[PDB]
């Protein structure tokens, strides 16, 4: 079916419609229905799901739960074009696909289609969870570069968030933590980019596997403290102290993967995507006809 | 004889 976005997803799960889910999982639903004792012969179960009564949707949510599926975009070129997700059921008729994963599939949303495949046997469910799961493919096999790099909206939300301007609301005030930085942004007393001394507590792990806390006052902005609320423990503050374009957020996720491993990098990739979408929505970053500024010197050059 | 099946092909190549 045709794909669509659904940005509420965690990156190990994808949205899958109820009609496709009841068609692809007919034998598991038959086995579940025969186990409970609701029906007797197989025919009765096929009439039940042909009618789609009120009790087979609980059966369907109990066959989905921990059963991965293989999503596949139709021109598969490398191995990151078949990835295994966990379904989340969708009122609708379109596969909801987590956005970061799109940069692996070369999948935009201009009319694309993807195929779902079901691992039937038990070794195949374990291969989908342990080799082909989308959390397991965060580095491209051609090199060392991360393939779950945040693509387009989220880097605009970050670049508007962690930046600065020479005067805003709350210029040069002092803040006792990142929590009241977000509280000053939400209440309407400061701006998202307004330079400010905060007190942040960065955890540097300089010992042999022991995280040592160092707390200090960084001359930073409001947005850099709000984004510091999402960074895991081990990364230093200077990973967010800059302006965070796309190369900088890619090496942010890369340094998180090299230091803190896989699980903080998966949960931190999701928190990056969520905060990028949220502050890009709050940014209101349009495009106008006045934004393309003609040079005044252009006509004399011609 | 590469992936998960490399153990199966080790077993079959050992038991000849």
């Amino acid at each position: 079916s045709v794909i669509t976005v659904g940005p509420y997803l965690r990156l190990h799960q994808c949205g899958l419609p109820k009609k496709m889910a009841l068609e692809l999982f007919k034998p598991f639903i038959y086995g579940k229905l025969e186990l409970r004792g609701l029906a007797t012969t197989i025919k009765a179960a096929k009439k039940m799901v042909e009618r789609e009564e009120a009790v087979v949707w609980d059966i369907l949510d109990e066959v989905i739960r921990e059963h991965p599926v293989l999503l596949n975009r139709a021109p598969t070129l490398h191995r990151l074009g078949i990835q295994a997700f966990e379904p989340v059921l969708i009122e609708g008729k379109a596969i909801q696909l987590h956005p970061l994963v799109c940069a692996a599939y070369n999948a935009d949303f201009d009319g694309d289609q993807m195929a779902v495949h079901v691992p039937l046997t038990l070794e195949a469910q374990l291969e989908a969870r342990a080799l082909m799961m989308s959390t397991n493919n965060i580095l491209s096999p051609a090199n060392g570069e991360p393939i779950i790099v945040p693509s387009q909206d989220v880097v605009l939300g970050l670049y508007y968030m962690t930046r600065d301007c020479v005067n805003a609301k709350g210029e040069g005030m002092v803040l006792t933590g990142p929590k009241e930085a977000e509280r000053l942004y939400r209440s309407g007393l400061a701006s998202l980019h307004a330079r400010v001394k905060v007190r942040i507590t960065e955890y540097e792990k300089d010992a042999n596997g022991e995280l040592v806390a160092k707390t200090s006052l960084k001359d930073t902005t409001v947005g850099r403290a709000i984004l510091w609320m999402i960074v895991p423990k081990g990364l230093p503050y200077s990973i967010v102290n800059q302006a965070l374009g796309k190369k900088a957020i890619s090496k942010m996720l890369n340094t998180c993967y090299r230091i803190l491993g896989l699980k903080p990098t998966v949960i931190f990739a999701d928190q990056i995507m969520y905060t990028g979408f949220a502050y890009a929505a709050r940014s209101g970053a349009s495009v106008g006809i006045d934004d393309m500024v003609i040079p005044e010197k252009k006509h004399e050059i011609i | 004889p590469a992936g998960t099946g490399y153990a199966y092909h080790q077993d079959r190549m050992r038991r000849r």
Binding site: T4, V5, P7, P99, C102, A107, D108, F109, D110, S151, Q152, D153, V154, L156, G157, M273, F277, A278, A280, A281, S283, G284, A285, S286, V287 | -
Partner: protein, 249 residues
């Protein structure tokens, strides 16, 4: 309509063949959803063949891409029309212009990720106004072939049915005009032959009652393909000559 067009819409609408262009100008006499009657002006008119023109519009019928090629009358009554002028708008036309889609209030802003790569995010005010609600028409055919053990039966008189098997069919198998069906009902009931064998000495009284001599039959009725709803708007029945016309034909 397009609010921002190029003025080229009238050439594409009139110079195609979906609108009902007036041949001789004059005064409209009778407008209807079916037909339009123009009374021809006297300074455009033949001496003989007295002449008031009738435009029979093309109502709801199937296009090639399963769209709905409609024609709506756009003139009032008593209204003057000139030679070379639209009378009935066609599909995706309006007053002789060319209106393909519809014009809606758009804003350019990132909104919480739901328009990430190229996606579009639409209010429920659009679907409540029934303004993209397109109308499609599917043609479903059912032939009565000629095989061994005899010809087929279209007469709804068949077995393996339920009140839900033919509660929408008439007394001769074909679904009504207007019956709103679901995905998987029966539109045309059709039974064919199977085994020949011979006559049985059990159903003797029943064979005297009906006079049927088959007696066992199969089932090959046309059904709505699984997934689509609809409303049966038009039924055609063509009969090869010699065959008995049933009551609905």
């Amino acid at each position: 309509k397009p609010l921002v067009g190029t003025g080229m819409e009238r050439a594409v609408a009139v110079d195609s063949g979906v609108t009902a262009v007036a041949k001789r100008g004059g005064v409209v006499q009778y407008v209807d959803a079916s037909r339009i009657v123009i009374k021809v002006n006297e300074d455009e008119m033949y001496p003989g063949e007295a002449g008031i023109d009738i435009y029979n519009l093309t109502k709801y019928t199937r296009s090639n891409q399963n769209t709905c090629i409609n024609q709506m009358p756009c003139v009032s009554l008593g209204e003057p029309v000139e030679r070379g002028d639209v009378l009935a708008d066609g599909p995706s036309t309006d007053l002789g212009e060319l209106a393909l889609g519809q014009n809606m209030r758009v804003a350019f802003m990132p909104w919480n990720g739901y328009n990430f790569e190229d996606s579009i995010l639409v209010s429920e005010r659009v679907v409540q106004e029934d303004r993209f609600t397109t109308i499609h028409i599917q043609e479903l055919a059912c032939v009565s072939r000629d095989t061994k053990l005899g010809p087929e039966e279209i007469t709804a008189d068949i077995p393996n049915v339920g009140e839900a098997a033919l509660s929408k069919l008439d007394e001769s198998g074909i679904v009504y005009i207007g019956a709103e069906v679901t995905g998987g009902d029966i539109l045309v009931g059709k039974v064919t032959p199977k085994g020949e064998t011979q006559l049985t000495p059990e159903e003797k009284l029943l064979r005297a009652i009906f006079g049927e001599k088959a007696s066992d039959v199969k089932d090959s009725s046309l059904r709505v393909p699984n997934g689509v709803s609809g409303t049966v708007i038009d039924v055609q029945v063509f009969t090869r000559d010699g065959v008995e016309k049933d009551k609905r034909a």
